[PDB]
Amino acid sequence: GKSKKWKEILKFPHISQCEDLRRTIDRDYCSLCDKQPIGRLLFRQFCETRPGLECYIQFLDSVAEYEVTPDEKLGEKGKEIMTKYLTPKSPVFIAQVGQDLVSQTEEKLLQKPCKELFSACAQSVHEYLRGEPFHEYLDSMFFDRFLQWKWLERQPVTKNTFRQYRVLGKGGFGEVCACQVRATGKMYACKRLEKKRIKKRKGESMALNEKQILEKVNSQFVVNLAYAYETKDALCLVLTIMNGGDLKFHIYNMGNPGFEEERALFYAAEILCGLEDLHRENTVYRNLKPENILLDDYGHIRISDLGLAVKIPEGDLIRGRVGTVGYMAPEVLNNQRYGLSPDYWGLGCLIYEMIEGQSPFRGRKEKVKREEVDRRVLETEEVYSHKFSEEAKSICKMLLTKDAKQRLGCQEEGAAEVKRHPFFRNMNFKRLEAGMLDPPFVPDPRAVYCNLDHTDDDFYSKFSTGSVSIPWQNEMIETECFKELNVFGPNGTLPPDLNRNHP
Ligand SMILES: Cc1[nH]c(/C=C2\C(=O)N=C3CC=C(C(=O)N[C@H](C)c4ccccc4)C=C32)c(C)c1C(=O)NC[C@@H](O)C1CCOCC1
């Protein structure tokens, strides 16, 4: 699906074009060698040349595999890492973790193993690469190549960059599309926001608020922002495409209604990880309802529709009676100053509704007024059935605690208090965050579930910021544009584009 001549659109600039990039990029090791996908790869590729550095990359890979190994096979995997990397006689031995560190970790294996047994060594290893190897990579052809990729990353994005397809739904301020990048062929989802409608309503602040929240979140379980460009007559937001339908459809149309507890467990775990990633940016979602939880092609879920989401200043609370009837926490209904607590209430609503096949305060076959629904939320205790295990009852009623001060996860411990709950006792969040747990339902690939003012000029300039860095680099990797273009000279020589001699 890559546009003919995509190798020209993504043609590397000559390294002489990136001098202004060199003198402005902050040389942070974590960002340049880990956070940014292409930087991580290029730094890993730099270590692939040195024999002394090669060993340290293989070890970190094996530690990553140890973290997600089943508990019954930790001692097995653990011993393998010792007799390969931590033995002084090995051909590929880690020398920078002092002998006074190898002898320590050799003891944790003399007892029941923990999945973080190698965290001390991995951090020691990183502190070594953080110094001499990193600064040598900065003066290497691979960091010059990184700059070339950054140069491309910053190129202007317009409509020309994309190839609009069918309308994949609509909302309250525009429609959705099936974006495709012509150069890479990766599918996306637009969120068109017609300029006429946003100016008339005076909601420019909410448009940028959403785009900036979507841009700062980098979760596997929340819709991510890849591009933000402006078209004549609209402001677009290019988001993760989700083709598996929403969770409301699967609860009520595919369901009993409702799911088996173990299946609801899986979706709850991923929704909780999404909420945790949002809360890292002290951002409250406030729109948690089954139809906003979408499924992708693999069966995993992401939180969508962040239009009612707000970034809370650390140490401050906010007001806002917003959301959907039936899914508003008590502190929200009372128009009080709250923080992240509404989201753990919503989680309770979602777990309950997934298991029971109806909302905890409104019967599926009940005809009630908005006001009676609200009274129940403030006054009535929800009742449970035999569909809920004792653990499921617990987490639900602790998340559905009316008082936001005693509500689960609303303490200073945050979402960690929720992952520790006996309801997730059989859930390994390390393996879930890594994508190694098979979803309970896989959508079929063929399935189909369904004016001239100048002050406005400044608002487009702050919004239409173009490509988002981490998603863009991931796009290049997924589509194998990186593997194909990231070619150097034969036998570790400089290719023409990285040789300052002849442009
Ligand atoms: C293709 C598709 N897109 C979407 C919507 C989204 C998606 O993917 N990612 C985001 C991110 C963020 C949002 C979001 O904020 N919306 C809010 C309310 C909004 C507010 C105001 C204006 C606009 C929107 C929505 C979406 C969905 C739910 C589906 C689906 O499941 N189709 C089933 C089946 O028909 C496909 C079709 C194609 O091929 C066969 C399988």
Swiss-Prot record:
What stretch of residues is annotated with the motif Nuclear localization signal? Answer: 364-371
Entry-linked InterPro entries: AGC-kinase_C (IPR000961), GPCR_kinase (IPR000239), Kinase-like_dom_sf (IPR011009), Prot_kinase_dom (IPR000719), Protein_kinase_ATP_BS (IPR017441), RGS (IPR016137), RGS_sf (IPR036305), RGS_subdomain_2 (IPR044926)
Quaternary assembly: Interacts with ST13 (via the C-terminus 303-319 AA). Interacts with TP53/p53. Interacts with HTR4 (via C-terminus 330-346 AA); this interaction is promoted by 5-HT (serotonin). Interacts with HDAC5. Interacts with GIT1.
Tell me which residues make up the RGS domain: 29-147
Q: What is this protein called?
A: G protein-coupled receptor kinase 5
The first-level EC class reads transferase
Q: What induces it?
A: Overexpressed during heart failure.
Which organism is this protein's natural source?
Answer: Homo sapiens (Human)
Which coarse location class applies to the principal site listed for this UniProt protein?
A: cytoplasm
Per the record, which residues fall in region N-terminal?
1-161
Give the similarity note. Belongs to the protein kinase superfamily. AGC Ser/Thr protein kinase family. GPRK subfamily.
- Write the Enzyme Commission number(s) for this entry: 2.7.11.16
- Please provide one cellular component term from the Gene Ontology annotations of this protein: nuclear membrane
